[PDB]
From a paper:
In purple photosynthetic bacteria, the membrane-bound RCs closely associate with light-harvesting complex 1 ([name]) to form the RC-[name] core supercomplexes (2–14). The [name] ring of purple bacteria captures photons from solar energy or peripheral antenna complexes, such as LH2, and transports energy to the RC. The RC then uses the energy to initiate a charge separation and electron transfer, ultimately creating proton gradients across the chromatophore membrane to produce adenosine 5′-triphosphate (ATP).
In the RC-[name] monomer of Rba. blasticus, a total of 34 BChls a, 29 SPOs, two bacteriopheophytins (BPhes), 7 ubiquinone-10 (UQ-10) molecules, and one nonheme Fe were identified. The RC contains a BChl a pair as the primary electron donors, two BChl a monomers, one SPO, two BPhes, two UQ-10 molecules (QA and QB), and an Fe2+ ion. The intra-subunit Mg-Mg distances range from 9.6 to 10.3 Å, whereas the Mg-Mg distances of BChls associated with neighboring [name] subunits are slightly shorter, ranging from 7.9 to 8.5 Å. In [name]-1, the absence of SPO-β is attributed to the steric hindrance caused by PufX. Among them, Q3 and Q5 are potential UQ-10 molecules located in the gap between the [name] ring and the RC. Furthermore, two previously unidentified UQ-10 molecules (assigned as Q6 and Q7) were found in both the Rba. blasticus RC-[name] monomers and dimers.
Numbering used by the authors:
A (entry chain 0): 6 to 49
B (entry chain L): 2 to 282
C (entry chain 9), G (entry chain A), L (entry chain D), M (entry chain F), N (entry chain I): 1 to 53
D (entry chain H): 1 to 254
E (entry chain M): 3 to 306
F (entry chain X): 14 to 64
H (entry chain B), J (entry chain 8), K (entry chain E): 7 to 49
I (entry chain 7): 1 to 45
């Protein structure tokens, strides 16, 4: 209904699916890095 | 967000780097390549200052001071707890200032106006540089640069000056002071005149530039004009900053003694040296 | 939670991606520097030490 | 009154600095409000009044009494915003979302958009205190001559394309301020067109106008009269010429 | 590509003698000279000038002030022109000795200082009234006078008011080039460090802001002079694209903007605040505060 | 083929601009240091302002 | 209480979202640095201590 | 009455989603606070 | 993850390639300088 | 959609070449990193 | 009378919602004040 | 007391909402910092002392 | 006295309300800081000395 | 004094009222501060001395 951007629900859902794919890949890499660093030099 | 007249001016173009890329607005602000870059540098420098004063343990914004490295460290990059943070903040400040000026360039060439404003900003950028980059390099160390603190860079001013007796006796210092004083005088007078013409006595019609010229002629016998006063104040400020940069670039690089002893060449001129009388006789 | 995609009916992807990239690079640099500023967690000095160099 | 604290460490100097902080807050408020007598209320890209109008309120209207019978101007006023309002602009939205540029649809120089924009000022000349017209051709300015510097009159006019479009003919001068404002050009097409002096550089052998190319000199807005130029015409002309720094760059050489 | 820093072509005709709006045309001169060297930058017409009672009084008194200082200079040099030109910047008509307190000094240097300062008082206030009346005659506002009044406030604080509160004319400023610099330095030294005066810092903030602001404003007008920006009084009532493009440059650059009338209020206020804050700061030094670094330490902007 | 070389040229042109900027900054700094080497030795013996 | 959704008939969601994001990031940064300034809540120096480094 | 042009249904939906986001933010913050309390209490 | 090619439907690839070259060059230069600033990792010395 | 104007297939081809170059760059970089780690370990 | 263009009913509704928010804010503040008092009183 | 809702006929809701939001955040920060300045109400140092750290 | 409602025929209620709010808040803050200055009216120190901390 | 009401034909009531309010407030503040400066008319210190605290 309301769209300050022109994107519809379908377009927004597709864009969001790709956004979240990228976000979760980024977060996976960051998590692996954090695990490795905690193994090498813990901070907690 | 838009002023009543802002729409017709929001067009594409006026970019030095990037095209369609980064050609948009965030509220009123225009953000391009250099808007992005200066935001990054400014935020990083702010966060570096905050982390530095956190390390020190100081949160009173009037006691925060990020000091440079020591004079013994020389020109080398120092430990971040010993001056590396000052160095990074200085890099970021230079980048942010230069990106601000180039953003102004982009905005000007989007609006169709002249590039006088970034030119004028470049003078202040260059004076900041004279202080933190060039004069330290010629002196051999970053420890001669001023610290990033509200009241500690005043201590730097005072001590740097009193290292040469009274700094009042530097001649380029004199010129800078005179130009600053005259700039403030001229700004006060310009504002006063424009407002006196535009907001006149109750019950009188709005005035013109004729009335302004006439007021200042009747007062002092000369009127420089509407364009002349602007050219004049611009150049006054620029010459003030130029002579300040001169006073500092020569201070510990070409001069090393008290600045009051410089003037004694006009006293030691061989024809009036030993005449008795006066202060120096 | 099921309807967060509507943030794209609110924000433009371009400005959002620009801002997000700048923010992430800034934050990463900031944390790496916070670490390098500690004699510990400085992996360069710590490696120099661990290997007798 | 040294070391004379009303309470705690609070002496006349602390009282003074806090009083100054207050006065300065009030002063920033006053100045930012007085800076709102033009441009408000805020608008959308659709032309509508925006939900956000600012954090400082628009101030009360003041009145400017104009000389020469020109009337009374109230600032802020819906009449002043309507008179200075451009209608039927030739721009297309680049995006549905806000904060993105608007693209011209035709020739932005002729259509008066972007850096070639003009404001609908009053179609009446700027007057001096005596009621005469401020800008005149130097032939109609009695006593005026070139006291110093190069006379451009008769010099060819080189354009951004490095091509010549005509020769300078006359000088339009601000009489009360005694300065050149526009120089008129005799175009090789048989037409007379004005060009601001601020966008013209006098060389020894030529007048160089790098803003606009040879194609644009013909479509410059003309004056309805040959002896006077109105504020509106001035704004149109100067906008047209300036817009060339952007819209005539592909043609510009050297 | 033409930056409008210098004029390419000068034109001129009969001199603009002025406007009759309440002015007495008898007290205004009839002589004008055009100087082209000034035309490359501003206007070339030198003159005319209004010669009235207040300007006459101020001229007389200021000439007497200048001449009194110069006469003391000639005495201090032993009537030797060579020692006068050698020590010109080192000679000085110095403020009275402290032994005299606030009473009329009983010395030659001191009474000469007193009388020169009397002439200075008369001249400066006569010139203030001159400004007020020259504006009132043309039906113009008194903004010039109210701006001059701030500089007069600081000048008074230095010469008349603060010496009284502190109880001695020796606190006032001497009449010499280098001696008044030494006076500033010794003033800062006697009272901690004048840097740590808050009103001194404010005066400096506004001094720097005056140059920042005029650079911005003049660069703006020269940037929009191609659209008629220098003609500000006509842009105030009949807004053109010059004003709009200036406002938009500054809005896009830093988010907020001014009007063509409204930036001159910023200008006026940044001007007058320099001297207002400076006068207050000079009053508070010695009278309310003996050391500014200790004051800063107590009040939380100097470390202990 | 054509698209590979096109994109590689675009990236290398960006790298060349960056390298030019770096060369310029380094030339400026290094030349300032050298010019400082020409100055008297008291230019290197100044007392510290401690900040 | 059941009518707070009216706050979007008053403020625009874009401006509110940008404002709250800046506010939250800055607040988080300031609190993190406040804790980092206290050597008792500086988790880095802690991990340096409990592990003998 | 609306200063933004949004109807009650639009704003109600927007608020539902904003509430979901706020409660998720607060949940993560609560879990983090509990962790930090077990690790190093402040009260 | 398979639909990442739509980032070129958002940003012009020419400007992105140029900016990426610039970014990567400056990052590499910064890291090389950080390492040169340390005797153990400096390889010229 | 294509703010730029590229069709899905143009973008597919360009992304193909882009990922090719990316993986090449990453391989060269990991090789250099192995070399530097044999020379000067940092972990 | 009105300076902002709100009728009696619009403003009565606005006030209802504003007072709801205000009393929620105040209830939270009161709970927190009681807690801080029990933890470390000041009067 | 029954007629306070006319403050909305006199005042604009948006400006006063933003104003009181800023005012409340700054007042909260002000009081928190006042307490933090007093060693007896600094919850961080108080907890440090309470647990022997 | 019964005609004191005529100040609203001389003053704009909006200006008056804003100015009154500012004045009252600043006066309150001023008085509270005066009391905090005095050791015998600083409730924070009084409670500390009362409860033995 | 029968015709003192003409000062309103002369002077404008709005300016008069604003200036009179500012003036009276500043006068009162200055007098209270003068009293606080004096240990004998400091009502707070006098209360301390009176009630044994
Ligand atoms: C629209 C905006 C307009 C703005 C301008 C307004 C203009 C109109 C008029 C406004 C009038 C305002 C009030 C004026 C009169 C009062 C002046 C004043 O505040 O004096 C300082 C006043 C005390 O006066 P004093 O005589 O200088 O104090 C001597 C005492 O012996 C002090 O010693 P003590 O015995 O109390 O203890 C000292 C100790 C204890 O410290 C304290 O008790 C407090 C110290 C830190 C205070 C920090 C306050 C920060 C507030 C920020 C709020 C957010 C921003 C607000 C503004 C936003 C917009 C810009 O200090 C320390 O630093 C200890 C640190 C920890 C050691 C372990 O300060 C306090 O009472 C404590 C701070 C309270 C907050 C001050 C905020 C300013
Ligand atoms: C060692 C030196 C001390 C110091 C001691 C002082 C002292 C002492 C004073 C200041 C003052 C000032 N200092 Mg200092 N100052 C220091 C450090 C600095 C530094 C710096 C970067 O280090 C800066 C930027 C400044 C800046 C300033 C100005 C902001 C300020 C004066 C403003 C002004 O326009 O006065 C100049 C303007 C006037 C004097 C007004 C003149 C008006 C009259 C009416 C002129 C009439 C003309 C006459 C009749 C003759 C006319 C001739 C013919 C017509 C041609 N100082 C250090 C710490 N400074 C002054 C101030 O404001 O105090 C806070 C002051 O008294
Ligand atoms: C001809 O008349 C004129 C006008 O009117 C027509 C004017 O208005 C002005 C303008 C002058 C004034 C309004 C007078 C007052 C100005 C001053 C006293 C000058 C001092 C200035 C300031 C205190 C303002 C400083 C503000 C800054 C630096 C902006 C801070 C903002 C940011 C850091 C964020 C910027 C955002 C960016 C780049 C985009 C974000 C990008 C992302 C990726 C995220 C002038 C000169 C004028 O002459
Ligand atoms: C402290 C000194 C100023 C630091 C900068 C503060 C302003 C800022 O960052 O953004 C302002 C922001 C940035 O622009 P903006 O886009 O938020 O402007 C919005 C303006 N309205 C809402 C009215 C449409 O602007 C404002 O908040 C508006 C008014 C600002 C006026 C500030 C003037 C300060 C001058 C100080 C001189 C005296 C020094 C002593
Ligand atoms: C952002 C503010 C952060 C303040 C942090 C803090 O606690 O600072 C302590 C300081 C308190 O100083 P203080 O109490 O530490 O200083 C004296 C202490 N001795 C004597 C030990 C040195 O807070 C401030 O300085 C607050 C300054 C801003 C207050 C509001 C100003 C409004 C007017 C315009 C300016
Ligand atoms: C001071 O205290 C310190 C700093 C020490 C501690 C503070 C820490 C803080 C404040 C941490 C804050 C962390 C935050 C806020 C983290 C946020 C992370 C997020 C939100 C990450 C998001 C990542 C998103 C990624 C990587 C997305 C990638 C997307 C792609 C690679 C492709 C997507 C494709 C698109 C959009 C094409 C679709 C287009 C069309 C037209 C269909
Ligand atoms: C000095 O004192 C110190 C600092 C030490 C201590 C003091 C601390 C203080 C004073 C802290 C104050 C903290 C406050 C006030 C925190 C407030 C937090 C809030 C209000 C957080 C809210 C978060 C909301 C979030 C994350 C919302 C997210 C929403 C979404 C993801 C969805 C957005 C909605 C959509 C997309 C719907 C759109 C619908 C349509 C139809 C277009
Ligand atoms: C130095 O001195 C110290 C600081 C130590 C001591 C002094 C302290 C002082 C002077 C403290 C003063 C405190 C004051 C004056 C506090 C005032 C607080 C107030 C008035 C708080 C009000 C809060 C209101 C809230 C949170 C309202 C929230 C409302 C909502 C969430 C809903 C908004 C309503 C809507 C959307 C209306 C519906 C709309 C339509 C169109 C129907
Ligand atoms: C050195 O001095 C110290 C600080 C030590 C001692 C103090 C000195 C001095 C000089 C103190 C002076 C104190 C003074 C003058 C205090 C005066 C206080 C007053 C007059 C307070 C008045 C407060 C009034 C309030 C809060 C009114 C609130 C009203 C409303 C919420 C309702 C308003 C009307 C509404 C909402 C309906 C409007 C109707 C329509 C149709 C639009
Ligand atoms: C070749 O030589 C001849 C004789 C031909 C001419 C040469 C003249 C020369 C060389 C003149 C040199 C003049 C100089 C160097 C003047 C320098 C003046 C300076 C730098 C002054 C600086 C500051 C002065 C201030 C702030 C003065 C303030 C004075 C007042 C506020 C006056 C207040 C009144 C007082 C003290 C008492 C008198 C009042 C009554 C009611 C009797
Ligand atoms: C042993 O002997 C004993 C016990 C008797 C000794 C004890 C003595 C004591 C306890 C003395 C206490 C004295 C006190 C506490 C006096 C209190 C006075 C009070 C409570 C005054 C209350 C209110 C005053 C007001 C509202 C004053 C308002 C003044 C105005 C100017 C407001 C109207 C004008 C404004 C706002 C400015 C604009 C002007 C116009 C005309 C629109
Ligand atoms: C200050 O803190 C320090 C620096 C110490 C630590 C922090 C480091 C940080 C924050 C590092 C951040 C690194 C990042 C964000 C790296 C990102 C790298 C990426 C995304 C690289 C992508 C590269 C892609 C390339 C070079 C693609 C090139 C493609 C072509 C040339 C197309 C043609 C390809 C052909 C012909 C291949 C044929 C086989
Ligand atoms: Fe101007």
């Amino acid at each position: 209904d309301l769209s300050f951007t022109g994107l519809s629900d379908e377009q927004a859902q597709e864009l969001h699916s790709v956004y979240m794919s990228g976000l979760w890949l980024f977060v996976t890499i960051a998590v692996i890095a954090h695990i490795a660093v905690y193994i090498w030099r813990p901070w907690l | 967000a838009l002023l009543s007249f802002e729409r017709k001016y929001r067009v594409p173009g006026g970019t030095l780097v990037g095209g369609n890329l980064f050609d948009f607005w965030v509220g009123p602000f225009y953000v391009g390549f250099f808007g992005v870059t200066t935001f990054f540098f400014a935020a990083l420098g702010t966060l570096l200052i905050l982390y530095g004063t956190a390390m020190e343990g100081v949160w009173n914004p009037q006691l925060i001071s990020i000091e440079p490295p020591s004079v013994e460290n020389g020109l080398a990059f120092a430990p971040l707890a010993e001056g590396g943070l000052w160095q990074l903040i200085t890099i970021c400040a230079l980048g942010a200032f230069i990106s601000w000026a180039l953003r102004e360039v982009e905005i000007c060439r989007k609006l169709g106006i002249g590039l006088h404003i970034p030119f004028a900003f470049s003078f202040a950028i260059l004076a900041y540089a004279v202080l933190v980059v060039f004069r330290p390099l010629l002196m051999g160390s970053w420890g001669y640069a001023f610290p990033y603190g509200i009241w500690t860079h005043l201590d730097w001013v005072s001590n740097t000056g009193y290292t040469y007796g009274n700094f009042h006796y530097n001649p380029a210092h004199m010129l800078g002071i005179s130009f600053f004083f005259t700039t403030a005088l001229a700004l006060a007078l310009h504002g006063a005149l424009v407002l006196s013409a535009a907001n006149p006595e109750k019950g009188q019609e709005m005035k013109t530039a004729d009335h302004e010229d006439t007021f200042f002629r009747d007062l002092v016998g000369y009127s420089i004009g509407t364009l002349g006063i602007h050219r004049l104040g611009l150049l006054l400020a620029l010459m003030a900053v130029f002579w300040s940069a001169v006073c500092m670039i020569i201070t510990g690089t070409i001069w090393f003694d008290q600045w009051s002893n410089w003037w004694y060449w006009w006293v030691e001129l061989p024809w009036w040296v030993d005449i008795p009388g006066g202060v120096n006789g | 939670m099921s309807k967060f995609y509507k943030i794209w009916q609110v924000f433009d992807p371009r400005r959002v991606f620009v801002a997000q990239g700048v923010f992430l690079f800034l934050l990463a640099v900031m944390i790496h520097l916070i670490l390098l500023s500690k004699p510990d967690y400085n992996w360069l000095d710590v490696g120099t030490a661990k290997y007798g160099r | 009154m040294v070391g004379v604290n009303f309470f705690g460490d609070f002496d006349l100097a602390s009282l003074a600095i806090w009083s100054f902080w207050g006065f300065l807050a009030f002063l920033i408020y006053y100045l930012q409000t007085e800076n709102m007598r033009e441009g408000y209320p805020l608008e959308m890209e659709d032309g509508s009044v925006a939900p956000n109008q600012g954090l400082f309120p628009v101030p009360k209207p003041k009145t400017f009494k104009l000389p020469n019978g020109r009337g009374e101007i109230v600032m802020p006023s819906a009449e002043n915003e309507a008179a200075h309002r451009r209608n039927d602009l030739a721009l297309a939205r680049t995006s549905v979302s806000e904060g993105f540029p608007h693209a011209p649809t035709g020739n932005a120089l002729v259509d008066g958009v972007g850096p070639a924009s003009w404001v609908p000022r009053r179609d009446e000349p700027e007057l001096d205190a005596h009621g005469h017209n401020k800008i005149m051709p130097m032939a109609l300015a009695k006593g005026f001559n070139v006291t110093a510097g190069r006379d451009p009159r008769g010099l060819p006019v080189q354009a951004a394309d490095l091509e010549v479009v005509g020769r300078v003919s006359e000088l339009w001068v601000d009489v009360p301020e005694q300065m050149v404002r526009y120089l008129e050009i005799d175009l090789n097409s048989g037409k007379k067109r004005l060009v601001p002096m601020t966008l013209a550089k006098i060389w020894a052998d030529r007048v160089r106008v790098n803003a606009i190319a040879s194609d644009s000199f013909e479509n410059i807005p003309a004056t309805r009269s040959a002896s006077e130029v109105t504020k509106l015409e001035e704004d149109k002309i100067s906008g047209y010429v300036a817009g060339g720094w952007l819209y005539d760059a592909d043609k510009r050489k050297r | 590509e033409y930056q409008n820093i210098f004029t390419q072509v000068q034109v001129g005709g009969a001199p603009e003698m002025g406007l009759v709006e309440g002015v007495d045309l008898s007290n205004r001169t009839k002589g004008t000279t055009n100087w082209t060297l000034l035309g490359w930058f501003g206007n070339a017409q030198i003159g005319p000038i209004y010669l009235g009672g207040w300007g006459t009084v101020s001229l007389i008194s200021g000439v007497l002030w200048f001449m009194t200082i110069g006469a003391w200079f000639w005495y201090e040099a032993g009537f030797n022109p060579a020692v006068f030109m050698r020590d010109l910047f080192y000679l000085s008509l110095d403020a009275p000795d402290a032994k005299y307190g606030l009473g009329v000094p009983r010395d030659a240097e001191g009474i000469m200082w007193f009388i020169a300062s009397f002439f200075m008082f008369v001249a400066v206030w006569s010139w203030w009234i001159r400004t007020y009346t020259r504006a009132a005659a043309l039906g113009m506002g008194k903004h010039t006078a109210w701006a001059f009044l701030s500089a007069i406030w600081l000048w008074m604080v230095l010469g008349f008011i603060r010496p009284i509160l502190m109880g001695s004319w020796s606190e006032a400023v001497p009449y010499g080039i280098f001696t008044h610099l030494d006076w500033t330095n010794n003033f800062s030294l006697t009272y901690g460090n004048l840097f740590y005066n808050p009103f001194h810092g404010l005066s400096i903030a506004f001094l720097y802001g005056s140059a920042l602001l005029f650079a911005m404003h003049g660069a703006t007008i020269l940037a929009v002079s191609r659209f008629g920006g220098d003609r500000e009084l006509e842009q105030i009532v009949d807004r053109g694209t010059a004003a709009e493009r200036a406002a938009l440059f500054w809005r896009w650059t830093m988010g907020f903007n001014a009007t063509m009338e409204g930036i001159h209020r910023w200008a006026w206020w940044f001007g007058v605040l320099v001297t207002l804050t400076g006068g207050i700061g000079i009053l508070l030094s010695g009278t309310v505060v003996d050391n500014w670094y200790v004051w800063a330490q107590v009040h939380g902007y100097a470390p202990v | 083929i054509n698209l590979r070389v096109w994109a590689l040229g675009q990236m290398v042109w960006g790298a060349f601009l960056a390298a030019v900027g770096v060369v310029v900054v380094i030339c400026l700094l290094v030349g300032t240091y050298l010019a400082g080497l020409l100055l008297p030795e008291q230019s290197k013996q100044a007392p510290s302002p401690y900040g």
